[PDB]
Scaffold this motif. Structure first.
Motif, PDB file in Angstrom:
ATOM      1  N   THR A  84      17.213  11.933  16.943  1.00  0.00           N
ATOM      2  CA  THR A  84      18.262  11.074  17.475  1.00  0.00           C
ATOM      3  C   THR A  84      19.376  11.905  18.101  1.00  0.00           C
ATOM      4  O   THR A  84      19.647  13.032  17.681  1.00  0.00           O
ATOM      5  CB  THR A  84      18.857  10.176  16.382  1.00  0.00           C
ATOM      6  OG1 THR A  84      19.686  10.960  15.515  1.00  0.00           O
ATOM      7  CG2 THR A  84      17.752   9.522  15.564  1.00  0.00           C
TER       8      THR A  84
ATOM      9  N   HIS B 134      17.004  12.611   7.816  1.00  0.00           N
ATOM     10  CA  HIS B 134      16.561  11.546   8.702  1.00  0.00           C
ATOM     11  C   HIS B 134      15.121  11.225   8.310  1.00  0.00           C
ATOM     12  O   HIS B 134      14.290  12.148   8.217  1.00  0.00           O
ATOM     13  CB  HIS B 134      16.643  11.946  10.177  1.00  0.00           C
ATOM     14  CG  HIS B 134      16.592  10.785  11.122  1.00  0.00           C
ATOM     15  ND1 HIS B 134      15.411  10.294  11.635  1.00  0.00           N
ATOM     16  CD2 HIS B 134      17.578  10.020  11.648  1.00  0.00           C
ATOM     17  CE1 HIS B 134      15.672   9.275  12.435  1.00  0.00           C
ATOM     18  NE2 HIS B 134      16.979   9.089  12.461  1.00  0.00           N
TER      19      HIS B 134
ATOM     20  N   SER C  69      19.087   2.575  16.108  1.00  0.00           N
ATOM     21  CA  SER C  69      18.765   3.736  15.288  1.00  0.00           C
ATOM     22  C   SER C  69      19.601   3.675  14.015  1.00  0.00           C
ATOM     23  O   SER C  69      20.427   2.765  13.864  1.00  0.00           O
ATOM     24  CB  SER C  69      19.028   5.034  16.054  1.00  0.00           C
ATOM     25  OG  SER C  69      20.366   5.463  15.884  1.00  0.00           O
ATOM     26  N   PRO C  70      19.423   4.609  13.077  1.00  0.00           N
ATOM     27  CA  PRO C  70      20.204   4.538  11.832  1.00  0.00           C
ATOM     28  C   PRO C  70      21.705   4.555  12.056  1.00  0.00           C
ATOM     29  O   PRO C  70      22.445   3.959  11.263  1.00  0.00           O
ATOM     30  CB  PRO C  70      19.737   5.778  11.054  1.00  0.00           C
ATOM     31  CG  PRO C  70      18.393   6.093  11.608  1.00  0.00           C
ATOM     32  CD  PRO C  70      18.451   5.715  13.056  1.00  0.00           C
ATOM     33  N   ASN C  71      22.181   5.218  13.113  1.00  0.00           N
ATOM     34  CA  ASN C  71      23.608   5.323  13.394  1.00  0.00           C
ATOM     35  C   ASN C  71      23.968   4.774  14.771  1.00  0.00           C
ATOM     36  O   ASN C  71      25.079   5.010  15.254  1.00  0.00           O
ATOM     37  CB  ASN C  71      24.063   6.778  13.271  1.00  0.00           C
ATOM     38  CG  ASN C  71      23.498   7.465  12.044  1.00  0.00           C
ATOM     39  OD1 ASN C  71      23.461   6.886  10.958  1.00  0.00           O
ATOM     40  ND2 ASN C  71      23.052   8.704  12.212  1.00  0.00           N
ATOM     41  N   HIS C  72      23.057   4.045  15.413  1.00  0.00           N
ATOM     42  CA  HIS C  72      23.289   3.464  16.734  1.00  0.00           C
ATOM     43  C   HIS C  72      23.420   1.951  16.579  1.00  0.00           C
ATOM     44  O   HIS C  72      22.416   1.237  16.482  1.00  0.00           O
ATOM     45  CB  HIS C  72      22.162   3.825  17.697  1.00  0.00           C
ATOM     46  CG  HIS C  72      22.230   5.230  18.208  1.00  0.00           C
ATOM     47  ND1 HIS C  72      22.290   6.324  17.372  1.00  0.00           N
ATOM     48  CD2 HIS C  72      22.241   5.719  19.471  1.00  0.00           C
ATOM     49  CE1 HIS C  72      22.337   7.428  18.099  1.00  0.00           C
ATOM     50  NE2 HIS C  72      22.310   7.088  19.375  1.00  0.00           N
TER      51      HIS C  72
ATOM     52  N   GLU D 179      22.635  11.303  18.060  1.00  0.00           N
ATOM     53  CA  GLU D 179      23.791  11.475  17.186  1.00  0.00           C
ATOM     54  C   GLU D 179      23.594  12.662  16.252  1.00  0.00           C
ATOM     55  O   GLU D 179      24.540  13.410  15.978  1.00  0.00           O
ATOM     56  CB  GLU D 179      24.045  10.199  16.384  1.00  0.00           C
ATOM     57  CG  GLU D 179      25.435  10.137  15.764  1.00  0.00           C
ATOM     58  CD  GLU D 179      25.446   9.456  14.410  1.00  0.00           C
ATOM     59  OE1 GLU D 179      24.554   9.748  13.587  1.00  0.00           O
ATOM     60  OE2 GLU D 179      26.349   8.628  14.169  1.00  0.00           O
TER      61      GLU D 179
ATOM     62  N   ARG E 277      20.947  17.521   7.652  1.00  0.00           N
ATOM     63  CA  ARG E 277      21.192  16.085   7.614  1.00  0.00           C
ATOM     64  C   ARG E 277      19.852  15.370   7.506  1.00  0.00           C
ATOM     65  O   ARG E 277      18.923  15.669   8.262  1.00  0.00           O
ATOM     66  CB  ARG E 277      21.956  15.631   8.862  1.00  0.00           C
ATOM     67  CG  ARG E 277      22.065  14.121   9.042  1.00  0.00           C
ATOM     68  CD  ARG E 277      22.780  13.457   7.877  1.00  0.00           C
ATOM     69  NE  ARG E 277      22.773  12.004   7.995  1.00  0.00           N
ATOM     70  CZ  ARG E 277      23.657  11.302   8.693  1.00  0.00           C
ATOM     71  NH1 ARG E 277      24.639  11.889   9.359  1.00  0.00           N
ATOM     72  NH2 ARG E 277      23.552   9.977   8.726  1.00  0.00           N
TER      73      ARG E 277
END
Lengths: 104, 104
Positions: free
Chosen positions: A13, A52, B40-43, A15, A50
């Motif tokens: 991703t 994921h 996404s997990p943070n989107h 981010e 981190r």
């Protein structure tokens, strides 16, 4: 702790790439953990891991900037060892950063 | 409420695109409703709903500006969950907008 050899991967991703944290599977490491990645006896780079879910176990996914900085190529062998930062001294109070526009 | 997966689409009408609201179907939701979309997990990106019969059930049509804003493409699976505004604190009184000529 002592380290384990494994395969590099591609950052899932965007981010995660922006966070400057190497992306790891939940079965390998944990979020907030600092590790040292070795590609040779004189190529060491310390990253923050981190978690994921997408990352396959036994492999760390590095974004293009991280791979370029550490000279990592996707699919290559690298060792990762848990790193304990000497917070008493290695804590950064002031740091200088040269910033440019990433895309011109 | 709990969240349902679906696929994006293209905004049917120019007026709907101008209204800047995710174009949905009357079966899926109702006009004036509010949603948050996960890619996404943070989107996460927040959208306002507007019902149009042309929308096929289980799909939401987003305009080109909205798709470029939220990084959404036509043909991608994403999650949508109804969101309720906290009017006690989330009401907008003054909004600063930078305005440019859309087409030069």
């Amino acid at each position: 702790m002592a380290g384990r050899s494994m395969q590099a991967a591609r950052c899932p991703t965007d981010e995660l790439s922006l966070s400057n944290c190497a992306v790891v599977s939940e079965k390998d490491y944990q979020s907030g953990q600092h590790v040292i990645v070795r590609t040779s006896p004189n190529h060491k780079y310390i990253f923050t891991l981190r978690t994921h879910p997408s990352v396959v176990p036994g492999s760390v996914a590095f974004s293009l900037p991280q791979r370029k900085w550490a000279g990592l190529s996707i699919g290559q062998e690298i060792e990762v060892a848990l790193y304990s930062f000497d917070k008493a001294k290695q804590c950064i109070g002031t740091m200088t950063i040269e910033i440019d526009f990433l895309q011109k």
